[PDB]
Nucleic acid binder design. Structure first.
Ligand SMILES: Nc1ncnc2c1ncn2[C@@H]1O[C@H](COP(=O)(O)OP(=O)(O)OP(=O)(O)O)[C@@H](O)[C@H]1O
Lengths: 231, 588
DNA sequence: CGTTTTATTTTTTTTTTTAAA
């Protein structure tokens, strides 16, 4: 896609050229800060993003995931180009967003699928933290070993018991987290999330009973803790 | 095609809705004008229309409804295209109304495809649970574009072929993303109470509804549904509908005048005579229960229970509150349940029900353990359906030692969480309550403490701030007012006291007072210290357990009575009369 | 003239029932 040409330029012209707030922009330093803490969660703020170029809100939603590819390739190509020193260890990347507009539960519907989202929740019971599979390999005769992994934990959120619509039922939704954004969920807290809406890969697609069994699922690019009860 | 009959009914449909409909102009374009935001697709049209111009060709419409409704949905789109800058992305939602026509017993096989009108209640409900209804695919080979209708319950991913003879079990996975799908919900609903048979029960029936109809339903209301009964392709039965018809524009005693809003309280011009002339209170003591007689203190006191309380502007550190805990006792054979029953007619969310029957699980839901919908739906209940409402109950007497777990929450916590195998959240009690215990042999024999005259639990008589009992006496001239009133109780001519304040003008004026929010820098409000002090001079004798939780009554009753003047800026006099009957409360 | 069949366990709330100085 020849379009893919210009986007990374608009990143590459943006992560190591921009200055805001009277110099030494974070992007010069956050990466290395991340690199010094081995973190892989370098953050963007959409407000600064629109301060430079708000065009990244309107070619995004035809597939924001390819946008995130077009983010991570740039980041990678900055780190190991500038920290080829880094070229040993983990050597993979993704970024974060914090469109800092609060929007609410019980509104995502027919027209909120797989698109630019921003939502909260409140946390309750879920499972441990466990792994998955990642890659396309299994064959040689004419594989279930040496096949890279990625951790996993299930969520469960809940909604504000303060801003309730007066005897409307407290509700519930099934949502996901992933390896790097994991081991921070616990019962009884809230967490503000970038958020993104879809369904299962295939949630029971067939002639069936008098109603399909369909679910709806979300994950976070960014999570920013709202509670933070220590320093 | 036979159904071109209904397409001509759909021609018929267009013919009047695009043409002159009513008012010298259009009826059905402001709907159309509004739908453009998400391509909203929801539009209501009168069924009388099929009488105004179709000339009672409803029987050319009203039978083939699920048969031809699709075509009516096609007509909606064909309307929109004729003038709106349009591509055929427009979908379906048609929500007919105006059917002078109204039940569960009038149901058969035969009732398919109609538009009858029915009303029910809100219970036992399920949430948003969408359906990616449309979608694309093909057989093993090549033809990867199908904008078809895969939505009929008989739908399947693998198909046979489009251009060439292909496999018959293979499938592609395809465009479920640049396309149009739906959303819906599902519940159970029970037979109305305007309709009530002998023997039989308001049996349960189950239904779905559309996006604009969705999550716009609350506790016990009277709406007009659509009679599109439909099959289960399992069978068993179901049904369906598309139209509902459940205070800026004014209540009864009006015609249009001006206010803070359009006609929210506009009719001051007629209210105000009945607002300030403080003997109007006597109408509210006399012209409201003319068919009834008892003490005259209840009939001068309940009103502020019905009416809003404090609702001030103060802290986040702690809540302040308006309503009050309440009771009434005596012994039976004294007409002590007429009134509660009447409230169900008088006032909204006057849910007169027994307490004798209820469980501790009366209030919320308890359990699910199979995939009903999601294996954990324990957020159904009985109380918080008080939509700005109260739950007064009978037979608080033999009740268990668990209900207090909720009543402990009454005026401080008002929050709702459960120690079950589900989750915990909370909710807002909007509600007050009534007390309905009774004594053993009745008489509260005046030799032992009134606490000990029943001797019930520990904190109950801390929280309930007024009890307002009527106890029995034997002086039969008392009794000879009664039957000589019931001289006109059956004798059908003016068989009560002459009134002076209709129910509907009463009920309207209730609101005018609830949007004034008084402001209290009252020097007499500073001399409540002397009021409460001379009170405690009277408390000093007759030596109950008294504190500032009762001061809360000292505050609210008079301040909310200044509301009851439809007034800001509290007036000291309300305190003294408030003092008076409340000076009985220790002597009570 | 060939190439494939088949399993579920623990907890709730009601209405039953049952316990000690
Ligand atoms: N002041 C009064 N006004 C109207 N009716 C009265 C009055 N005093 C007595 N009565 C009559 O006396 C009868 C008392 O019996 P009633 O049916 O009230 O029992 P109840 O109070 O409902 O018992 P409980 O309240 O314990 O259920 C009432 O039906 C009522 O009509």
């Amino acid at each position: 896609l020849g379009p893919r040409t210009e986007i990374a330029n608009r990143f590459q012209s943006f992560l190591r050229t921009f200055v805001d707030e009277r110099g030494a922009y974070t992007y010069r330093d956050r990466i290395r800060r991340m690199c010094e803490q081995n973190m892989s969660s370098f953050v963007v703020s959409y407000t600064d993003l629109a301060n430079k170029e708000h065009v990244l809100a309107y070619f995004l939603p035809e597939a924001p995931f390819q946008m995130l590819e077009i983010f991570d390739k740039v980041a990678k190509d900055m780190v190991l180009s500038i920290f080829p020193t880094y070229e040993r260890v983990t050597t993979e990347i993704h970024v974060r967003i914090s469109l800092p507009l609060i929007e609410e539960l019980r509104t995502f519907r027919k027209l909120h699928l797989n698109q630019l989202v921003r939502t909260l929740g409140v946390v309750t019971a879920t499972t441990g933290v466990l792994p998955q599979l990642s890659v396309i390999k299994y064959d040689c005769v004419k594989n279930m070993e040496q096949t890279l992994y990625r951790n996993y934990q299930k969520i469960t959120l809940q909604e504000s018991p303060g801003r309730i619509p007066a005897g409307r039922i407290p509700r519930s939704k099934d949502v996901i987290l992933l390896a790097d954004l994991c081991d921070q969920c616990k019962p009884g807290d809230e967490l503000e999330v970038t958020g993104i809406y879809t369904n299962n890969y295939d949630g029971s697609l067939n002639t069936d009973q008098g109603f399909p069994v369909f679910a709806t699922v979300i994950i976070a690019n960014h999570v920013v803790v709202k509670d933070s009860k220590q320093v | 095609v036979k159904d071109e009959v209904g397409i001509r009914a759909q021609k018929l449909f267009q013919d009047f809705l695009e043409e002159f409909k009513e008012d010298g102009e259009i009826k059905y374009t402001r709907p159309a004008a509004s739908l453009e935001s998400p391509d909203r697709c929801t539009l209501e049209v009168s069924f009388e229309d099929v009488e105004k111009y179709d000339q009672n060709l409803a029987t050319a419409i009203i039978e083939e409804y699920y048969h031809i409704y699709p075509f009516l949905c096609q007509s909606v789109s064909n309307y929109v295209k004729d003038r709106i800058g349009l591509k055929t992305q427009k979908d379906c939602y048609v929500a007919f109304t105006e059917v002078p026509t109204r039940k569960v017993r009038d149901l058969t096989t035969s009732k398919i495809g109609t538009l009858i009108r029915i009303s029910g209640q809100v219970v036992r409900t399920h949430p948003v649970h969408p359906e990616l209804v449309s979608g694309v695919f093909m057989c093993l080979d090549c033809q990867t574009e199908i904008r078809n209708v895969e939505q009929q319950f008989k739908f399947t991913n693998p198909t046979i072929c489009r251009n060439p003879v292909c496999s018959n079990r293979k499938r592609f996975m395809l465009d479920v993303e640049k396309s149009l799908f739906l959303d819906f919900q599902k519940i159970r609903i029970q037979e109305t109470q305007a309709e009530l048979p002998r023997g039989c029960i308001p049996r349960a029936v189950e239904i779905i509804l559309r996006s604009e109809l969705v999550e716009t339903v609350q506790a016990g209301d009277r709406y007009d549904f659509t009679g599109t009964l439909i099959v289960v392709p399992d069978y068993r039965m179901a049904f369906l509908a598309c139209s509902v018809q459940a205070t800026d524009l004014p209540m009864s005693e009006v015609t249009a005048e001006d206010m803070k809003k359009q006609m929210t309280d506009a009719e001051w011009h007629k209210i105000y005579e009945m607002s300030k002339d403080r003997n109007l209170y006597q109408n509210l003591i006399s012209s409201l229960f003319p068919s009834i007689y008892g003490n005259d203190e209840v009939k001068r006191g309940i009103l502020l229970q019905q009416f809003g309380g404090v609702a001030k502007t103060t802290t986040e550190k702690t809540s302040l509150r308006g309503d009050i805990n309440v009771c009434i006792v005596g012994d039976p054979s004294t007409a002590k349940s007429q009134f509660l029953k009447q409230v169900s007619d008088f006032s909204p969310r006057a849910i007169y029900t027994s307490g004798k029957a209820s469980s501790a699980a009366g209030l919320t839901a308890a359990v699910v353990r199979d995939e009903e919908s999601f294996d954990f739906v324990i957020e159904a209940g009985a109380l918080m359906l008080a939509d700005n409402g109260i739950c007064c109950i009978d037979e608080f007497d033999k009740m268990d030692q668990r209900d207090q777990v909720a009543i402990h929450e009454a005026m401080e916590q008002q929050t709702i969480s459960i120690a079950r195998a589900g989750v915990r959240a909370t909710l807002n009690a909007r509600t007050s309550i009534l007390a309905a215990a009774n004594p053993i042999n009745g008489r509260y024999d005046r030799s032992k403490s009134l606490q000990q005259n029943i001797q019930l639990s520990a904190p109950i008589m801390s929280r309930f701030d007024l009890f307002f009992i009527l106890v029995d006496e034997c002086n039969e001239v008392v009794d000879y007012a009664i039957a000589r009133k019931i001289v006109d109780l059956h004798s059908n001519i003016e068989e009560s006291v002459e009134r002076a304040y209709t129910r509907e003008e009463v009920l309207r004026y209730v609101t005018f007072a609830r949007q004034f929010k008084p402001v209290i820098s009252q020097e007499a409000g500073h001399m409540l210290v002397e009021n409460y002090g001379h009170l405690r001079q009277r408390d000093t004798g007759t030596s109950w357990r008294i504190t500032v939780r009762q001061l809360e009554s000292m505050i609210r009753l008079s301040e909310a009575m200044a509301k009851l003047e439809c007034s800001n800026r509290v007036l000291e006099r309300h305190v003294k009369e408030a003092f008076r009957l409340l000076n009985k409360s220790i002597i009570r």
